[PDB]
Amino acid sequence: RTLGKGSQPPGPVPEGLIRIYSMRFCPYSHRTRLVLKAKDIRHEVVNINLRNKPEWYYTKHPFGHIPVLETSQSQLIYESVIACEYLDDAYPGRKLFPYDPYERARQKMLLELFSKVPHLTKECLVALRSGRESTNLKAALRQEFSNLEEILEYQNTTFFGGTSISMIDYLLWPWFERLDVYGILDCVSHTPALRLWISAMKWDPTVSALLMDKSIFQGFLNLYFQNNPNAFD
Amino acid sequence: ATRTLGKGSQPPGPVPEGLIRIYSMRFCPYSHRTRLVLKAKDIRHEVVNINLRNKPEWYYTKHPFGHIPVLETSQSQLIYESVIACEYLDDAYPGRKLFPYDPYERARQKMLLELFSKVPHLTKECLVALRSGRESTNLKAALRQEFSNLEEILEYQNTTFFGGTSISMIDYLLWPWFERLDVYGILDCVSHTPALRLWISAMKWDPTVSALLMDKSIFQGFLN
Ligand SMILES: N[C@@H](CCC(=O)N[C@@H](CS)C(=O)NCC(=O)O)C(=O)O
Ligand SMILES: N[C@@H](CCC(=O)N[C@@H](CS)C(=O)NCC(=O)O)C(=O)O
Ligand SMILES: [Cl-]
Ligand SMILES: [Cl-]
């Protein structure tokens, strides 16, 4: 259950566990939850009410952002990209970043190329749910997706890092999962390799294990856009 | 310390095996950053300076929007921009490692980099304001606040440098903008942060920093 204003601090993180502060429908914390699951890392999730944060939560992140990792040695790591990197370096089995220093750098370059998508998807959602104009937002999103489509087509690989799923794919995934519920799946209608990638991601055991419940997510968005505080409980 | 390539210049040839190329500009702090790392790790490299106000047409095959810095390898690979380049260099080349080996300490340096993220733009805005004779009290106050965040870290850690008792990657990633405070006329923005002033001195005493340290009158002359 999500903690908010009035909730007591959780205790220290047990030895042999790492803690993630998250929220069930936040795509940034979804990144880091995929990495935790993909690496079979033993963890606990503490969900936070973003509209009505616990006052102690500002001791985990100064502006109360999520995600934050908290270790059994009381160390704090944030936000999502830095957390995912730490996890891959700190935990041994299944390495998600590639071995080649160049390929590692290329995945980080791809991540920069993706930097407008999160805000564009969110603005599209808000535009469609308020009845505001969305022609420009969708054209913009389609252009960002064409930039990704060119990479996949040029490489002739299913995934962004190659034939097998890797760190970059998990870093991009949360926003693609959301296209359906956001009502913007039409924004990949011009990008066939990207549509193949979505399907490949859905078949990934980690992705599949973390897929949101569509109906509950729609219910969250319905109360969120009515400005209801209960949306975050 | 060599001439800059502009519009109508010829494309450079392939980077020879055993060298790496950096596309830079002599007074660009983002490129300065990457040049510091090249030098600190004793990496054999060539610096190719680009005319940012009149870019070579070919340079857009190195970066789609003609940004610097860019690294170009003997394998024809392109790596950009400054932070990704710095990390690539530290991982791809052996010898002196600038990031800590420890995953947490390494992540912490990246967190410090993020805390610094407003400083580059604020320093530039302060320069532009002071040079054009425009308002700057609020820009300076904002810069002092970011510098207070950095002061707090050094004071809490009680170490000379941001990564501990010796210089490491994080210090080199921050340095370019601090070198520039003097010439920018905003040294007064560290008058309240004593650990930060000590750090400025520690940095100037570092051999790599000192080797790349701009001549004040030359830099003054550029900014005209
Ligand atoms: N750049 C950060 C962004 C994280 C972020 O903006 N998370 C959202 C939740 S999805 C947040 O902390 N928002 C809280 C708020 O707006 O009050 C990252 O990559 O993790
Ligand atoms: N985010 C990049 C920024 C690089 C950058 O903005 N460099 C400046 C020169 S110091 C530049 O390319 N400006 C010229 C332009 O915008 O075309 C980095 O971290 O290196
Ligand atoms: Cl699908
Ligand atoms: Cl000094």
XYZ file of C-alpha atoms and ligand atoms in Angstrom:
499
model
C 0.000 0.000 0.000
C 1.148 3.541 -0.848
C 2.496 5.657 2.027
C 1.674 9.347 2.335
C 1.380 12.230 4.776
C 0.955 10.721 8.234
C 2.606 7.360 7.497
C 5.532 6.367 9.742
C 8.985 5.900 8.213
C 9.775 2.353 7.152
C 12.526 0.692 9.190
C 16.093 0.118 8.033
C 16.472 -2.020 4.897
C 17.138 -5.664 5.862
C 20.534 -7.221 5.151
C 20.363 -9.036 1.797
C 17.658 -6.755 0.382
C 17.612 -3.440 -1.455
C 14.590 -1.109 -1.222
C 12.998 0.855 -4.037
C 10.731 3.841 -3.446
C 8.241 3.854 -6.289
C 4.646 4.439 -7.326
C 2.588 1.816 -9.142
C 1.890 3.868 -12.316
C 5.075 6.027 -12.524
C 7.042 5.129 -15.712
C 10.399 6.267 -14.295
C 10.196 3.900 -11.328
C 8.891 1.214 -13.727
C 12.320 1.388 -15.470
C 14.126 0.558 -12.300
C 11.621 -2.145 -11.262
C 12.254 -3.918 -14.615
C 16.007 -3.852 -13.993
C 15.536 -5.278 -10.460
C 13.339 -8.093 -11.781
C 15.473 -8.793 -14.883
C 18.523 -9.286 -12.662
C 16.648 -11.420 -10.141
C 17.610 -8.955 -7.411
C 15.901 -9.451 -4.053
C 14.047 -6.241 -3.268
C 11.120 -4.606 -1.545
C 8.945 -1.887 -3.048
C 7.698 1.031 -0.960
C 5.077 2.984 -2.862
C 4.716 6.721 -2.240
C 1.688 8.970 -2.590
C 3.114 11.674 -4.883
C 0.281 14.180 -4.277
C 0.410 13.779 -0.482
C 3.976 12.712 0.313
C 5.214 11.584 3.742
C 7.272 14.424 5.295
C 10.063 11.927 6.053
C 10.274 11.146 2.316
C 12.188 14.396 1.698
C 15.072 12.666 3.541
C 15.221 10.053 0.747
C 15.004 12.570 -2.109
C 15.366 16.344 -1.500
C 12.431 17.194 -3.828
C 10.591 13.937 -3.103
C 11.188 12.455 -6.551
C 10.969 8.732 -7.255
C 12.508 6.273 -7.866
C 15.089 6.129 -5.065
C 17.084 3.040 -4.060
C 17.957 2.572 -0.412
C 20.566 -0.013 0.603
C 21.061 -1.958 3.830
C 24.023 0.392 4.467
C 21.588 3.375 4.340
C 22.935 4.616 0.988
C 20.579 6.452 -1.407
C 20.698 6.184 -5.211
C 18.538 8.137 -7.656
C 16.994 8.849 -10.031
C 15.982 6.138 -12.555
C 18.930 6.076 -14.954
C 21.616 6.307 -12.285
C 19.716 3.688 -10.212
C 19.520 1.244 -13.164
C 23.264 1.712 -13.867
C 24.160 1.088 -10.210
C 22.037 -2.084 -10.111
C 23.738 -3.484 -13.232
C 27.229 -2.716 -11.906
C 26.571 -3.710 -8.257
C 24.769 -7.050 -8.807
C 26.648 -9.793 -10.645
C 24.354 -12.076 -12.680
C 22.766 -11.167 -15.997
C 24.603 -8.011 -17.129
C 22.147 -5.743 -18.977
C 24.589 -3.135 -20.367
C 26.783 -4.450 -23.230
C 30.396 -5.565 -22.746
C 31.902 -3.227 -25.360
C 32.587 0.291 -23.941
C 31.491 1.704 -27.333
C 28.195 -0.199 -27.293
C 27.595 0.924 -23.714
C 28.114 4.540 -24.900
C 25.792 3.972 -27.904
C 22.963 2.812 -25.606
C 23.439 6.013 -23.570
C 23.348 8.017 -26.823
C 20.095 6.261 -27.770
C 18.700 7.207 -24.344
C 19.474 10.909 -25.037
C 17.773 10.563 -28.424
C 14.655 9.367 -26.512
C 14.617 12.330 -24.069
C 11.532 14.178 -25.454
C 9.216 11.134 -25.536
C 8.277 10.959 -21.855
C 6.967 14.555 -21.749
C 5.306 14.248 -25.201
C 3.403 11.082 -24.175
C 2.274 12.810 -20.939
C 1.184 15.981 -22.783
C -0.739 13.799 -25.287
C -2.547 12.032 -22.441
C -3.389 15.346 -20.747
C -4.443 16.863 -24.104
C -6.825 13.993 -24.995
C -8.296 13.784 -21.465
C -9.012 17.552 -21.293
C -10.314 17.762 -24.884
C -7.456 20.108 -25.869
C -5.878 20.165 -29.354
C -3.368 17.340 -29.907
C -2.454 17.539 -33.623
C 0.953 19.082 -32.908
C 1.699 16.799 -29.961
C 1.010 13.642 -32.016
C 2.964 14.918 -35.018
C 5.864 15.620 -32.622
C 5.600 12.173 -31.028
C 5.442 10.512 -34.455
C 8.669 12.297 -35.427
C 10.438 11.058 -32.275
C 9.228 7.526 -33.077
C 10.466 7.868 -36.689
C 13.939 8.647 -35.256
C 13.766 5.357 -33.282
C 12.366 3.446 -36.283
C 15.369 4.555 -38.399
C 17.743 3.048 -35.828
C 15.952 -0.333 -35.795
C 15.666 -0.456 -39.607
C 19.314 0.516 -40.141
C 20.561 -2.063 -37.587
C 18.148 -4.805 -38.758
C 17.825 -6.139 -35.211
C 14.657 -6.705 -33.193
C 15.954 -4.841 -30.107
C 17.798 -1.499 -29.784
C 20.987 -3.145 -28.497
C 20.824 -6.201 -30.796
C 19.145 -9.614 -31.175
C 18.638 -9.956 -27.406
C 16.912 -7.601 -24.959
C 19.356 -5.332 -23.079
C 19.461 -2.274 -20.743
C 18.368 0.263 -23.388
C 15.158 -1.645 -24.170
C 14.123 -1.702 -20.496
C 14.918 2.040 -20.182
C 12.507 2.871 -23.072
C 9.769 0.334 -22.338
C 7.513 2.024 -19.728
C 6.325 4.739 -22.138
C 5.616 2.260 -24.938
C 3.547 0.058 -22.615
C 1.465 3.123 -21.896
C 0.592 4.002 -25.539
C -2.466 1.733 -25.437
C -4.035 3.145 -22.230
C -3.056 6.698 -23.242
C -5.008 6.293 -26.519
C -1.976 6.983 -28.734
C -1.157 3.543 -30.219
C -1.893 5.188 -33.605
C 1.436 7.054 -33.166
C 3.332 3.863 -34.130
C 1.134 3.166 -37.209
C 3.896 4.467 -39.530
C 6.801 2.600 -37.809
C 6.718 -1.180 -38.476
C 10.000 -2.201 -36.833
C 8.928 -0.384 -33.632
C 5.653 -2.370 -33.611
C 7.696 -5.584 -33.883
C 9.823 -4.339 -30.956
C 6.705 -3.728 -28.801
C 5.614 -7.339 -29.406
C 9.140 -8.673 -28.662
C 9.180 -6.697 -25.413
C 5.770 -8.041 -24.338
C 7.131 -11.609 -24.768
C 10.065 -10.820 -22.448
C 9.538 -12.656 -19.165
C 10.474 -9.563 -17.077
C 8.292 -7.168 -19.077
C 5.434 -9.654 -19.005
C 5.730 -10.107 -15.227
C 5.461 -6.312 -14.657
C 2.681 -5.446 -17.181
C 0.123 -3.051 -15.678
C -3.512 -4.096 -15.292
C -5.153 -2.062 -18.072
C -8.531 -1.674 -16.346
C -7.036 -0.572 -12.994
C -4.725 1.853 -14.808
C -7.707 3.407 -16.642
C -9.447 3.726 -13.246
C -6.386 5.524 -11.854
C -6.350 7.976 -14.775
C -10.101 8.639 -14.371
C -9.689 9.857 -10.753
C -6.370 11.595 -11.521
C -7.959 13.792 -14.222
C -10.900 14.598 -11.918
C -8.287 16.075 -9.518
C -9.180 13.491 -6.844
C -6.536 12.933 -4.096
C -7.711 9.291 -3.717
C -6.109 8.532 -7.128
C -2.715 8.155 -5.394
C -3.786 5.842 -2.494
C 46.585 25.785 -29.857
C 45.888 25.365 -33.617
C 43.575 26.989 -36.193
C 39.849 26.263 -36.419
C 37.993 24.637 -39.319
C 35.042 26.515 -40.809
C 32.765 26.469 -43.847
C 34.637 25.408 -47.010
C 37.288 23.402 -45.098
C 38.027 19.793 -46.088
C 36.853 16.741 -44.118
C 39.546 15.186 -41.941
C 40.816 11.759 -42.952
C 40.391 8.575 -40.915
C 41.674 8.537 -37.312
C 44.921 6.506 -37.245
C 45.160 3.310 -35.153
C 46.372 4.164 -31.657
C 44.877 7.683 -31.757
C 41.429 9.014 -30.896
C 40.091 12.323 -32.243
C 38.138 15.001 -30.384
C 36.211 17.734 -32.112
C 36.424 20.740 -29.859
C 36.559 24.541 -29.683
C 39.326 26.232 -27.622
C 37.040 28.087 -25.205
C 34.085 25.651 -25.030
C 33.676 24.353 -21.449
C 31.908 21.157 -22.532
C 34.890 20.191 -24.733
C 37.272 21.371 -22.005
C 35.688 18.723 -19.849
C 36.533 15.935 -22.294
C 40.028 17.268 -22.984
C 40.755 17.165 -19.220
C 39.861 13.457 -19.163
C 41.962 12.709 -22.274
C 44.994 14.359 -20.636
C 44.488 12.957 -17.122
C 44.436 9.392 -18.515
C 47.449 10.101 -20.777
C 45.436 9.157 -23.893
C 47.046 9.840 -27.264
C 44.641 12.113 -29.102
C 44.296 14.923 -31.590
C 42.150 17.984 -31.027
C 40.347 19.253 -34.133
C 38.856 22.707 -33.482
C 35.554 23.634 -35.171
C 34.201 27.126 -36.001
C 30.842 27.085 -34.151
C 29.647 30.394 -35.687
C 30.366 29.070 -39.212
C 30.401 25.256 -39.092
C 31.932 23.063 -41.813
C 29.212 21.386 -43.893
C 30.922 18.009 -43.302
C 30.767 18.456 -39.506
C 27.051 17.518 -39.565
C 28.157 13.946 -40.416
C 29.932 13.964 -37.004
C 26.980 15.374 -35.019
C 23.514 15.790 -36.613
C 23.183 19.294 -35.093
C 26.877 20.223 -35.236
C 27.438 20.066 -31.463
C 30.759 19.655 -29.633
C 32.479 17.747 -28.169
C 32.476 14.633 -30.361
C 34.942 11.722 -30.201
C 35.785 9.882 -33.404
C 37.658 6.558 -33.167
C 40.022 4.631 -35.476
C 37.042 2.271 -36.022
C 34.985 5.245 -37.366
C 32.694 5.255 -34.303
C 31.247 8.589 -33.108
C 30.681 9.239 -29.378
C 28.989 12.344 -27.932
C 28.356 14.501 -26.014
C 30.704 15.461 -23.123
C 29.481 13.190 -20.314
C 29.027 10.029 -22.413
C 32.420 10.745 -24.015
C 34.130 11.102 -20.632
C 32.659 7.835 -19.375
C 33.547 6.013 -22.606
C 37.144 7.185 -22.299
C 37.474 6.060 -18.664
C 36.068 2.616 -19.453
C 37.734 2.016 -22.850
C 41.281 3.060 -21.838
C 43.437 1.365 -19.158
C 45.848 2.900 -16.650
C 44.576 5.723 -14.485
C 40.896 5.157 -13.675
C 39.099 8.419 -12.892
C 35.729 7.014 -11.778
C 35.812 4.972 -8.586
C 35.715 1.188 -9.007
C 32.997 0.936 -6.353
C 29.461 0.984 -7.892
C 27.956 3.147 -5.137
C 30.795 5.696 -5.172
C 30.548 5.822 -8.970
C 26.759 6.360 -8.808
C 27.307 9.105 -6.233
C 29.614 11.001 -8.614
C 26.880 10.861 -11.266
C 24.393 12.167 -8.690
C 26.774 15.102 -8.000
C 26.956 15.744 -11.748
C 23.127 15.989 -11.789
C 23.117 18.396 -8.797
C 25.463 20.633 -10.841
C 23.162 20.628 -13.903
C 21.964 24.281 -13.702
C 25.478 25.743 -13.281
C 26.660 25.762 -16.935
C 23.639 27.722 -18.205
C 23.638 30.122 -15.226
C 27.331 30.943 -15.634
C 26.771 31.697 -19.335
C 23.742 33.905 -18.553
C 25.778 35.767 -15.902
C 28.525 36.442 -18.472
C 26.011 37.651 -21.089
C 24.260 39.909 -18.549
C 27.484 41.512 -17.226
C 28.886 41.969 -20.752
C 25.666 43.484 -22.192
C 25.012 45.670 -19.116
C 21.767 43.903 -18.151
C 20.296 42.814 -14.791
C 22.351 40.159 -12.971
C 21.501 40.271 -9.214
C 18.999 37.420 -9.549
C 21.179 35.331 -11.879
C 24.079 35.679 -9.390
C 21.810 34.788 -6.450
C 20.675 31.644 -8.305
C 24.300 30.715 -8.994
C 25.221 31.317 -5.328
C 22.420 28.899 -4.359
C 23.727 26.105 -6.609
C 27.217 26.746 -5.235
C 25.788 26.481 -1.689
C 24.511 23.000 -2.580
C 28.046 22.041 -3.624
C 29.570 23.690 -0.518
C 27.232 21.603 1.669
C 28.575 18.394 0.091
C 32.240 19.281 0.636
C 31.471 20.450 4.180
C 29.486 17.293 5.046
C 32.119 14.956 3.537
C 35.026 16.934 4.987
C 37.253 16.090 2.032
C 39.118 18.410 -0.333
C 37.558 17.008 -3.520
C 34.031 15.924 -4.417
C 34.982 12.186 -4.563
C 37.252 12.164 -1.485
C 40.818 13.085 -0.583
C 42.179 12.931 -4.126
C 40.973 14.244 -7.482
C 38.680 12.002 -9.540
C 36.276 12.102 -12.523
C 33.636 14.291 -10.845
C 36.109 17.108 -10.137
C 37.215 17.233 -13.805
C 33.570 17.206 -15.004
C 32.846 20.328 -12.894
C 36.117 22.237 -13.356
C 35.598 24.062 -16.700
C 32.919 26.426 -15.348
C 34.926 27.184 -12.193
C 38.044 28.063 -14.213
C 35.878 30.594 -16.020
C 34.456 32.444 -12.948
C 37.441 34.812 -12.840
C 37.303 35.936 -16.493
C 33.473 35.914 -16.372
C 33.635 38.430 -13.457
C 31.613 36.203 -11.107
C 34.271 35.091 -8.623
C 32.138 36.979 -6.049
C 29.619 34.103 -6.381
C 31.944 31.869 -4.306
C 32.575 34.495 -1.561
C 30.244 32.582 0.832
C 31.543 29.062 0.143
C 34.985 28.544 1.753
C 35.401 24.806 1.058
C 34.584 25.543 -2.594
C 37.299 28.233 -2.802
C 39.799 25.734 -1.275
C 38.712 23.233 -3.954
C 39.309 25.809 -6.714
C 42.907 26.123 -5.505
C 43.337 22.306 -5.196
C 42.136 22.018 -8.793
C 44.527 24.669 -10.133
C 47.414 22.795 -8.434
C 46.474 19.531 -10.251
C 48.935 18.793 -13.106
C 46.226 18.066 -15.704
C 44.149 21.139 -14.794
C 47.273 23.276 -14.760
C 48.449 21.952 -18.162
C 45.128 22.953 -19.834
C 44.677 26.187 -17.833
C 43.755 29.005 -20.221
C 45.923 32.104 -20.267
C 43.746 34.816 -18.653
C 44.650 37.621 -21.097
C 44.185 35.329 -24.141
C 40.767 34.211 -22.871
C 39.880 37.823 -22.016
C 40.825 38.706 -25.621
C 38.663 35.924 -27.069
C 35.528 37.116 -25.232
C 35.733 40.477 -27.059
N 14.594 12.375 -14.255
C 13.963 11.513 -13.275
C 12.467 11.831 -13.213
C 11.691 11.023 -12.169
C 10.295 11.587 -11.996
O 9.952 12.836 -12.532
N 9.408 10.857 -11.322
C 8.083 11.377 -11.036
C 7.068 10.254 -10.832
S 6.689 9.311 -12.338
C 8.143 12.249 -9.820
O 9.181 12.057 -8.886
N 7.200 13.180 -9.695
C 6.729 13.619 -8.391
C 6.013 14.952 -8.450
O 5.816 15.533 -9.544
O 5.608 15.490 -7.395
C 14.211 10.055 -13.576
O 14.641 9.676 -14.673
O 13.996 9.187 -12.714
N 25.014 18.507 -23.373
C 26.226 18.701 -24.145
C 26.350 20.187 -24.521
C 27.415 20.517 -25.576
C 27.284 21.973 -25.998
O 26.061 22.656 -25.850
N 28.367 22.573 -26.498
C 28.292 23.896 -27.095
C 29.668 24.554 -27.161
S 30.441 24.828 -25.534
C 27.690 23.814 -28.471
O 27.774 22.617 -29.212
N 27.084 24.907 -28.940
C 26.981 25.174 -30.368
C 25.593 24.925 -30.910
O 24.592 24.926 -30.157
O 25.418 24.721 -32.132
C 27.381 18.170 -23.345
O 27.198 17.701 -22.207
O 28.529 18.140 -23.805
Cl 2.144 -5.938 -29.517
Cl 42.380 29.749 -6.360
